[PDB]
Target: Ferritin heavy chain, N-terminally processed
Amino acid sequence: STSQVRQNYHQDSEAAINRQINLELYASYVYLSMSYYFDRDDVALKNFAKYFLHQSHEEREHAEKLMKLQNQRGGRIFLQDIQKPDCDDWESGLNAMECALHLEKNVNQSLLELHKLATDKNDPHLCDFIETHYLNEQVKAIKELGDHVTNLRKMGAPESGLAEYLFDKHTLG
Amino acid sequence: STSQVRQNYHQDSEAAINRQINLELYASYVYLSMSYYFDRDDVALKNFAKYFLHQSHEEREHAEKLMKLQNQRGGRIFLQDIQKPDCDDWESGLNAMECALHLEKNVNQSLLELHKLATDKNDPHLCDFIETHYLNEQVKAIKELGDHVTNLRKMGAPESGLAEYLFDKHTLG
Amino acid sequence: STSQVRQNYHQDSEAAINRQINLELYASYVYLSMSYYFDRDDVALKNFAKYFLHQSHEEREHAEKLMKLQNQRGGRIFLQDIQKPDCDDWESGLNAMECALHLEKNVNQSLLELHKLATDKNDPHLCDFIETHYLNEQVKAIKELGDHVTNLRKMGAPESGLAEYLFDKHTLG
Amino acid sequence: STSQVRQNYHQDSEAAINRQINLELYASYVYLSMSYYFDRDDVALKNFAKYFLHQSHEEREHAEKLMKLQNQRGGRIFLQDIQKPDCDDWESGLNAMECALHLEKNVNQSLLELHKLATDKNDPHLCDFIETHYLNEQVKAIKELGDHVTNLRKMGAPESGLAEYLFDKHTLG
Amino acid sequence: STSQVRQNYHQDSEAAINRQINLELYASYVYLSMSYYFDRDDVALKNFAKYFLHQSHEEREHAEKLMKLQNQRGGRIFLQDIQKPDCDDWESGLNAMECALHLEKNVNQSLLELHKLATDKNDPHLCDFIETHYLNEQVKAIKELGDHVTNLRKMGAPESGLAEYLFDKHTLG
Amino acid sequence: STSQVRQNYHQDSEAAINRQINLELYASYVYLSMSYYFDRDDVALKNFAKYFLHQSHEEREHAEKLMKLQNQRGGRIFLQDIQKPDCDDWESGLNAMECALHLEKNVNQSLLELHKLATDKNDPHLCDFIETHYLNEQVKAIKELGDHVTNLRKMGAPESGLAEYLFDKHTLG
Ligand SMILES: [Mg+2]
Ligand SMILES: [Mg+2]
Ligand SMILES: [Mg+2]
Ligand SMILES: [Mg+2]
Ligand SMILES: [Mg+2]
Ligand code: NA
Ligand code: NA
Ligand code: NA
Ligand code: NA
Ligand code: NA
Ligand code: NA
Model:
């Protein structure tokens, strides 16, 4: 039953990786929803749409890298349903950015818990994997989203539709 | 409530498009599962894995094009859960190819029903969208998968592991 | 007696590094033996020979990097005899691949013990060195060897000499 | 009061980062002093001057990267006075190299304490940041300075002014 | 005790140069603080940050040129502590620009007093050094900062966060 | 039992080749030790280190060519332990060069005895192999090492650390 390659890879770590895969696919789905919200004719913020579509594809890449890791370590991928996102209508550029920030922090928290588990199970390869490929990416993503939210609020989003328009053009464009 | 762009776009068509989006995302998820099955150390068919990963990304593209369609027509995207695939373990290159063929035919059937609905609602734009972007793609994909299955069976898959090895190399490589 | 550069470098870590150097040189020697086994006129698998020769040189590189580390930290290299490999005759491509897999897992285990020691001695530079340069290399090597073994067995190695021939050509060539 | 981006970032870590920023700016100032000591007409070792000026700029870069980190994590930079260096006159190429070595080891010790704090506060992002960007840089810098000091002493520095002259030319030039 | 190169270089001029070096390093430190203030997630004006970082590096260059001068004339550099800047939080783009303008005028005044001393000590080399490298630089910098402040105020900074956003984009970007 | 390719290849020649393989691997190991001795922070002669590392790799190449020979003739490689070198500390550039010279002469003597055996067994292929690939290489290496030793001694090595420094720079650099 044991993979010929498996070494120093705890069942709890394997399970946590499967959970993280699902979470990354979920985040991808959330970003896809946001992107196409901004593609609506009654919202029409092309660069918001592009930004979130880019994030969606990036999250899918993160999930696939975790799947690759799972196979590298001799664990077995078990996929679960990808839940639909919490909203169909994201209301505004600012609200979408805040929800993205919240999502990224939730993903980061899950990654930190995964690192804690890896550390507890004395799995330095897994710890280094998380550090190298995920934790700094998360910190940068959170910082960028925070910068965006700060700018939007100072510009007067979301009540100033001019604010979101010019943000779309000058930051995201 | 009505989109400013909406014209000749029936509610039933909008709903059918949302269903098709979900089905395309589901197919993408199935192909992702198959790809990483072939990436397992105890299966180790790199070109099967690559082939199915390519199909997964292509299905995602199909879903995104349907979402773009929905917004172009002034319908509203409503996402649903993406169900996990039917299998974790796809057993063999041949079995995976047969399941892919079955999936593609199911997707094609849904597209045909969508076309029938479009036709019944006198929506020529939608009809030609389906015809141009989807139906021929499906026919080609089904033909290719059928060719693959035929070759694998004649080669002696799945009991002849040499068969799958050489197919991986010479057809998919 | 203390090196002018030495800082936060425990004697036990220095000794463990010297042991790892020896183990890496040993692995290099094993791979050299395997390579030239496949170069025999009665075995004659040129790409097996090339593959194992590449691995031999890579292991030598790993040893030299550990020696460089030892000097960087102000430890002192103490070399030991490099034991001859366990076999002169590696029997088959499959058997050689299995022995390589076993060897790589043994090297990985030694590296994990070294990381544990570094962690216990609060030596983050050494831990990061092991993580960055060794642990992922080992995981990849083990995964690749496992893929090779899986393919050979499915193809019918080692009784099917056609199996090894075609593997030599299509995977290793 | 809490930054919107802040997550898993302890106040003690924030304070330790501010201290490290100050220490890096201090090291930059020390190297600046040494550089321009060697630029004096009565010392006139152009390549010593260039070497230490390069080190000064590098230390400034290290400080700025720590400031960037502080903002990335949602901590707040608090700058302090940069103390003047301990010497105006560094006496000789050898003495300057020894003082540089001592300084670099002090910086390294501070970084190791910072890593210990990060580890104790379960901050893997901060630990990885220190490991990736600082610890190996410090080990290399210490090794290089030790090599320089060894060469100077063997050449006969600082009493052999020919020694320092030829070292300036052939190693640092 | 007298440098072999020293000629027509008064002790008072040497002391005034040392004071100017300190002032230039101080200005560099102020600009560094401002830059990283604008890099905060709750301020997030990337081009303000870049502008002030550029100014910081330029001020460091000015200090180093004065140190080079000191050695060229055969004076001796005596470094002092670099005081921390007056603020940690610069409040706004406009406020930072006004503080920068005030700082630059203070630096200019010190340069003018230095020139006056040079003139009084009949040091034409020093006078022309100041004139060539510093005074026009100061005049330009003061004019640029004044233009910036004027624009920000007319745009409605600092209460109009849109003002600072668009200034960051169109002037500083 | 006899290789299908074996022709005019005496068992005594096969055994002597196996001994020579071991001797070449031993020489490689000696040079590796010397190289990393010169890489020590308290020795710090980078070009000595590079020179001996080059020699180490060259000796490995010589061993591999002998292994290739063995298989070409239809003999069978039997590897033995590679003994650790006689010293951990090579004391000086001059002492290392003298030990290298002694080693090379020992290798040359073994080659000459091998040639004598080949000649006695009327093996012209083996004789010309030795002549073409080994004997002149040895003569050149011995001459070069002798030149190095002569220069070092005349320069005043090993008591004149300046001697070794300048030799490292100008001959080996
Ligand atoms: Mg505008
Ligand atoms: Mg074939
Ligand atoms: Mg790490
Ligand atoms: Mg010379
Ligand atoms: Mg003038
Ligand atoms: Na992610
Ligand atoms: Na499709
Ligand atoms: Na290795
Ligand atoms: Na530093
Ligand atoms: Na200035
Ligand atoms: Na040789």
